[PDB]
Write a protein that binds this ligand. Structure first.
Ligand SMILES: Nc1ncnc2c1ncn2[C@@H]1O[C@H](COP(=O)(O)OP(=O)(O)O)[C@@H](O)[C@H]1O
Ligand SMILES: Nc1ncnc2c1ncn2[C@@H]1O[C@H](COP(=O)(O)OP(=O)(O)O)[C@@H](O)[C@H]1O
Ligand SMILES: [Mg+2]
Ligand SMILES: [Mg+2]
Lengths: 466, 460
């Protein structure tokens, strides 16, 4: 009959690699490159280190189309005791905390590792030296899919004669370079443009080398772990916060200590609206009381905004500088909005617009999407960003014709980006986010409208002379 | 400092509900409904039972927008010992076996259960009565997200005095009926049009009741568990197939017994190309030998197609009938293609085209997507099917003006549909499937050309 079984997280993604962005050899190569670059960047600028990143892709077997991808960085490294699980245990991560990072699932690199053993037989190769480490630790690893645990094939150590800090990861996978080429280059090119404090070197499978020089030695303030904002915190999150407590807080104490934007005044008001007794021990909250808290958090209209300390923005100057460098337009403008909250997570939307000049002519805007400083490249038409741009009436902001030369850019940064898939190429339809993307686009479009009404006014004056 | 931690599969989806199709209350309402209907259909037609399914959505709290979704079927039920894990352990399923079903992840209904727990306090309710059971077994359940296991709130039984056989599931969740309304109705409508042997009753939050009567009592042959096709079988899958052997097979015995489309002569060709000794014991394949086997599978050019049997198609007749019923076109045609293989899995693409008549005028085709008999409604433009339809030059097949009345329908069935997400609303870019979708569309496109040519000569 029907037979019931369970799977481990490794077997789940091994069975369904298209869920992590490994559906074909071209996209696999792209995904492997991007997960590694993202890890190296989280290991550097999140810790105040100006990134030096080296990427190499070598064709190691033309017949079988197997490529070896190697990414070397000057990050903080990884404690040797954590290396096995970091790369060989699905759903293991140092990024499950409330803080803006590129990684978030504790899936990324293991997905590439899984794809690697599914199609070839060489283990993945890791070399790492933590900050102030006397040694360089080496590993060769595979994943035991059934147990979802690391298999240490080889493990070793060498004397770190040069202070060296950082990580090298090398993984062999099926690939399709000709099909993946243009998007891999566009990925690196787009991250560089918004990361001018980093330096990249890229050697491709044909042996081309490209150099992306550091343009500034000023590093953005690192994002930090924060407490949740109360707006949108759910029932399960409340139970987690309660379970994590090491003191016998009252409900009032709980509210003031465990969240952002709650002082003694807001707290009293929340307790009253939620029908809760200030002095009750929070550990004794009932299932129904938890519900009332959550709904109260949800409908409360007077919360202060979260702070921006958990976030790292591109910023208006850089957005504008980048759009000008790439597109050489007649006009550019941008906006970094104030922080909002969704589902307890702080978030900011940034928007830019560029018009005219070297921008090609078309029937629709070129749309550049970024999430947590990652350039999104695939699945553009399923993105909530695309949904919002398409629904906006550009005619109301001066866009005359069917055909025009416009570029629209949107950056969402958050302690949590809600992607449509673990492949992280498109952003899901979360209403609070959709609304604030719309609001941001309206603010920049208003600036465009300003540029265009001046142009029309100039034209209208010159018309009289004809 | 970096602090390393682990998550259970429940915790992972509780943190990231958008990954299972729960990004907002409108889509969650929709997703909950379809996960339940699909479970009910997997529990009936896969077992030779004419499906009788009732769906009710009650608005239970206006201010909080909480809806109770209840689905009742006449399926095979669930063994009482399995109910807790079936609904309360993420990554638990009876569908991990190689066979065409609507479910496949062992996540579906539990994602709704998680979403239910995240926003309100009532537990899910299950009543079930397996075949020949003299009892109705009842449950109220939640999920312990940290442990990823069931919490049993209530559990009991009652004598089956009315002769109920099947399952009833009710879940309370935040929802948005006005936003979801048209899509829920479309999902049920399109299911019914391709499932004429099923009967549905739908009662909505406004009190409307719609009856979808059974039109035929002839069910397609139930899909069964089948052996993999060698083409695209990967290294980990080889190891699982060896690990599961009850007998000390040789590599040669392995090849002809464990796979589809491998005779004793085909095996010999493969053992030679792979450089493997026929009489070596397969339990002793080295890591490298497995590599060479898989590569050989991938490169071999003379494999028979998988068996068309044990996939369950809509069929050309039903496809055209459906198109004619919905759209009343001047012309319709369809094709059920011969089976292919991808990544070890048998699949078939079916394609339909309608033109003229009551079909609206527009600048692109209306595209109707189905996967394993499921109508796909969201994220159409990220779908591989849409990609192919968009890239086809319809000028080559007649499409004259820039404003035409055309419907294109594609159905992909397989022992495994490769979705873009566990939300299962769109098919990923798997190259073998993409090539076949294009080939299939070209076939029906030639029939359309014959019509559009045989119709211009009329105006001329
Ligand atoms: N190059 C690197 N430098 C430092 N730490 C790394 C590097 N690569 C991976 N890690 C660590 O391993 C963990 C697992 O990474 P990954 O599987 O890609 O998931 P995620 O990035 O979502 O956490 C990361 O959280 C990080 O702590
Ligand atoms: N209405 C039902 N009748 C019989 N079995 C069911 C029903 N609903 C769920 N199940 C069982 O519970 C299991 C888990 O369902 P689900 O979480 O939706 O995952 P999946 O459908 O992918 O297996 C199913 O595999 C099925 O065996
Ligand atoms: Mg990562
Ligand atoms: Mg299911």
């Amino acid at each position: 009959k029907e037979k019931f079984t369970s799977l481990s997280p490794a077997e789940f993604f091994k069975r369904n690699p298209e869920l992590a962005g490994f559906p074909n050899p071209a996209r696999a190569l792209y995904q492997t490159v991007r997960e590694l670059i993202e890890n190296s960047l989280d290991a550097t600028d999140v810790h105040g280190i100006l990134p030096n990143i080296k990427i190499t892709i070598d064709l190691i077997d033309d017949a079988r189309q197997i490529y070896k991808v190697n990414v070397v960085d000057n990050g903080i490294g990884i404690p040797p005791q954590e290396v096995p699980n970091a790369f060989g245990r699905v759903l293991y991560s140092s990024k499950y905390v409330n803080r803006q990072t590129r990684g978030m699932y504790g899936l990324g690199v293991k997905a590439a590792v899984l794809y690697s053993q599914m199609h070839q037989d060489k283990p993945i190769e890791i070399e790492t030296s933590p900050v102030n480490s006397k040694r360089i630790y080496t590993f060769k690893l595979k994943i035991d899919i059934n147990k979802n645990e690391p298999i240490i094939v080889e493990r070793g150590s060498v004397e770190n004669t040069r202070g060296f800090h950082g990580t090298s990861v090398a993984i062999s996978i099926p690939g399709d370079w000709p099909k993946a080429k243009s998007r891999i280059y566009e990925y690196i090119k787009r991250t560089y443009i918004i990361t001018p404090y980093a330096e990249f070197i890229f050697k491709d499978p044909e042996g081309n080398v490209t150099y992306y020089p550091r343009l500034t030695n000023k590093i953005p303030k690192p994002p930090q772990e924060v407490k949740p904002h109360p707006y949108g915190v759910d029932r399960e999150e409340i139970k987690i916060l309660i379970n994590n407590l090491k003191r016998d807080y009252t409900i009032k104490e709980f509210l003031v200590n465990e969240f952002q934007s709650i002082g003694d005044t807001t707290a009293d008001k929340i307790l009253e609206l939620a029908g809760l007794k200030p002095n009750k021990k929070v550990k004794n909250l009932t299932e129904e009381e938890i519900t009332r808290l959550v709904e109260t958090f949800k409908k409360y209209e007077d919360f202060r905004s979260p702070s921006a300390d958990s976030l790292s923005v591109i910023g208006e100057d850089l957005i504008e500088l980048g759009l000008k460098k790439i597109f050489n337009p007649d006009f550019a403008a941008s906006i970094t909005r104030k922080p909002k909250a969704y589902q307890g997570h702080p978030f900011i939307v940034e928007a830019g617009v560029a018009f005219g000049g070297s921008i090609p002519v078309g029937e629709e805007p070129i749309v550049l999407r970024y999430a947590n400083k990652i350039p999104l490249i695939y699945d553009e038409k399923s993105d909530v960003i695309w949904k919002v741009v398409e629904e906006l009436d550009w005619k109301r902001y001066g866009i005359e014709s069917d055909q025009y030369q416009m570029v629209v850019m949107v950056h969402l940064c958050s302690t949590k980006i809600p992607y449509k898939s673990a492949g992280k190429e498109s952003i899901a339809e979360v209403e609070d986010i959709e609304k604030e993307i719309k609001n941001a686009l309206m603010e920049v479009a208003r600036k465009l409208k300003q540029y265009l009404s001046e142009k029309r006014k100039e034209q209208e004056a010159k018309k009289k002379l004809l």
